[PDB]
A = this chain, B = another copy of it.
């Protein structure tokens, strides 16, 4: 099987690295405007393969994406001093108007996995331009925020992250919704589990954890300039779910007909991931405060998309 990655920057390359180390696919193709950049990352990653799994890693053109079961869109415009959030959005939408049709021309049957930020709006753009069934276009969404939420809770509880069933929904950003209400561990309410563990989650602890998730990216960027290991692994995990027709449940972004009264908007909800991309959407147990948060998050994304024309 083959996986394509358009945009060979830190995110696209870290993603290829994860796919290689975990042996998700026999072939990985990197495509970038800067051909020398993609070739360098590709050789660097190919050299890692003898230590792990045989994988044909190479740089290429859109045409080289032929036959790919999934293509990760991690292409973005370089940020500069004095660039509002909207200015970025417009520029990246221009990038996608070029990339999407070019990718689909070479790999018409590929599932598109959107990473470019703002991921929810870009997922909407990809969806509109692709003219494919809604589920064929998936955005990473809050899959990384959910991981962050689980990792911070795990550190507080001294339990493996994978045993912490907590979710983050809505916008991958400021208005995201941490679903404390139905969070559970071992089949019991999170707060109740924490107490039993002797590591109760006080209101102070919860506010601190909220900040940790919400300000996660900002803090990482402050220390190293950009984030990429976390998303790289999240993208690789989603790619594997797709290539293996896993039918696993993840909080990812996709075109949603209606959510809390907001129509035609892309945001994250728990969904079933398989060979055709998203093949099922679930609407979880939300408290009133959470439903309110979700509505607001959806309206924010709806207006951002609308202003752009999608």
| Chain A residues with a Cβ under 8 A of chain B | 13-14, 17-18, 20-23, 26, 34, 36-41, 43-52, 54, 56, 144, 146-148, 150-151, 154-155, 158-163, 165, 167, 179, 182-189, 193, 196-197, 216, 219-224, 227-230, 232-234, 236-237, 244-249, 270-272, 280-285
Contact = CB atoms under 8 A, between A and B. Distances in A.
Given A43-B220, A47-B147, A167-B187, 11 more contacts: A17-B18, A17-B229, A36-B222, A37-B223, A41-B224, A46-B151, A54-B246, A54-B247, A54-B248, A162-B248, A188-B284
A45 B223 contact: no
A contact face: mostly helix, strand, loop, or mixed: helix
Contacts of A17: 14, 17-18, 229, 232
A35 B254 CA distance: 38
Given A282-B193, A284-B186, A272 B159 contact: yes
A189 B222 contact: no
Among A148, A154, A280, A281: residue with most chain B CB under 10 A: A280
A30 to B, nearest CB: 11
Contacts of A228: 44
Nearest to A189: B285
A43 to B, nearest CB: 6
B248 A47 contact: no
A289 B245 CA distance: 37
5 contacts: A21-B22, A47-B227, A52-B233, A159-B272, A182-B184
Contacts of A189: 285
A165 B183 CA distance: 12
B161 A249 contact: no
Given A182-B187, A223-B39, A48 B196 contact: no
A195 to B, nearest CB: 9
Copies in the complex: 4
A230 B146 CA distance: 30
Nearest to A16: B229
A272 B197 contact: yes
Contact of A187 (B49, B56, B237, B270): B270
A186 B226 CA distance: 30
Given A161-B54, A222-B40, A47 B144 contact: yes
Given A21-B233, A229-B41, A248-B162, A188 B285 contact: yes
Contacts of A245: 26
Smallest CB-CB A-B distances: 10 pairs: A40-B223, A187-B284, A47-B230, A186-B270, A48-B233, A36-B223, A54-B160, A40-B224, A50-B147, A51-B237
A197 B234 CA distance: 24
Contact of A50 (B162, B182, B220, B270): B162
Contacts of A197: 272, 280, 282
A188 B251 CA distance: 13
A219 B46 CA distance: 13
A186 B282 contact: yes
